Every structure is written in structure tokens, then in C-alpha cells.
Amino acid sequence: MNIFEMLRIDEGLRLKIYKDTEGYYTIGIGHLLTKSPSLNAAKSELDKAIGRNCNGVITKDEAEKLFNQDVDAAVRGILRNAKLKPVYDSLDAVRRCAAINQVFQMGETGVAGFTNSLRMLQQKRWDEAAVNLAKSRWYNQTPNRAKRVITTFRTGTWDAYK
């Protein structure tokens, strides 16, 4: 397992524009296009991202290209955030994948309310961190995925993704 295999399992792969768990236009491996409810605005964002007029459809190679960019951008973002970098740098490589997964799904603003969980993770109080992470809109709206990510933060293993 690695961050790409993990996110591929959590996000799936679809080559035509679809709406994500929050009802937002997305494509590929969880590439969010826009939070706009207008399909034409999402098509414009897709064309801008791929570099050609896609008519709402892309190829597997294009999906994987956006995925690599999105994972890379997630990591680089974490490193530029003064609240997230120290906790991230304190983690082992497996738990860092859980952190990237979280940010990939909810964005840095989405992780802003996780201050207490973050502190427990930096303290390596793993069971307590896991309990706190589940007291969230994140866990309640996507419990199966959150349970996998939380187990990864709790154990530092890939047991939840086999």
C-alpha cells in the first residue's frame, strides 16, 4: 500500500463527470471540479484542467495525471500550513498517508476544525486521537471511509486497506 493505492480505493475511478458525496461535480479519481451547481461551469473547469475540450469525458491516463497533481498539491499544501506541517512532520510515513487522505478529501479548511485531534496525533496519543477524530461531521457523513483513515492514524499500519 501507498498513498496512491489508498486514495484510489477511497475515491474510485470514473471517466465521466459525476457528483461526489457532497453533491459536487467531480471526475477521475476524486478530482473536484467546482462546488458550482452549474454543469457547464464544471465542464469549463475540466477543459481548463486537461487542456482540451473534453465534453465532460476523459481518459484513464488523463485521470491519473490529475490524480498525481492532486496528491502532490495536497502534500505541498500541508507543508505550507503552519498548523499542519509540525504535526505532519511528527508522523511516520504510514500515518502521513492518512493525513494526505484527509486533506485530499476535505481540503485544508476542512481540517481547520481538527485542532484537538491534531494535538493528540502530535502527542502520539493514538487511541485518544482516534476517538476525537470520529466526533466530526467528516465521520458522520462518510463513516466507512473515515473509519479506514482513522484506523490508519490509530495503528500506523495498512490493516484497513489490506
From Swiss-Prot:
It comes from the Viruses. Endolysin with lysozyme activity that degrades host peptidoglycans and participates with the holin and spanin proteins in the sequential events which lead to the programmed host cell lysis releasing the mature viral particles. Once the holin has permeabilized the host cell membrane, the endolysin can reach the periplasm and break down the peptidoglycan layer. HAMAP family: ENDOLYSIN_T4 (MF_04110). The active site is at 11 (proton donor/acceptor), 20 (proton donor/acceptor). Changing residue 20 to C: Nearly no effet on specific enzymatic activity. Keywords: Antimicrobial, Bacteriolytic enzyme, Cytolysis, Glycosidase, Host cell lysis by virus, Host cytoplasm, Hydrolase, Viral release from host cell. It catalyses: Hydrolysis of (1->4)-beta-linkages between N-acetylmuramic acid and N-acetyl-D-glucosamine residues in a peptidoglycan and between N-acetyl-D-glucosamine residues in chitodextrins. InterPro entries: Endolysin_T4_type (IPR034690), Glyco_hydro_24 (IPR002196), Lysozyme-like_dom_sf (IPR023346), Lysozyme_dom_sf (IPR023347), Phage_lysozyme-like (IPR052619), T4-type_lysozyme (IPR001165). Changing residue 20 to E/Q: Loss of 99% of enzymatic activity. Changing residue 132 to M/F: 2-fold decrease in enzymatic activity. It is found in: Host cytoplasm. Changing residue 117 to F: 10-fold decrease in enzymatic activity. This is Endolysin. Gene3D superfamilies: 1.10.530.40. Optimum pH is 7.3. Substrate binds at residues 32, 104, 117, 132. Belongs to the glycosyl hydrolase 24 family. The keyword Hydrolase applies. GO terms for molecular function: lysozyme activity. PANTHER family: T4-TYPE LYSOZYME 1-RELATED. Its main location: host cell. Pfam families: Phage_lysozyme. Its EC number is 3.2.1.17. GO terms for biological process: cell wall macromolecule catabolic process; defense response to bacterium; peptidoglycan catabolic process; viral release from host cell by cytolysis.
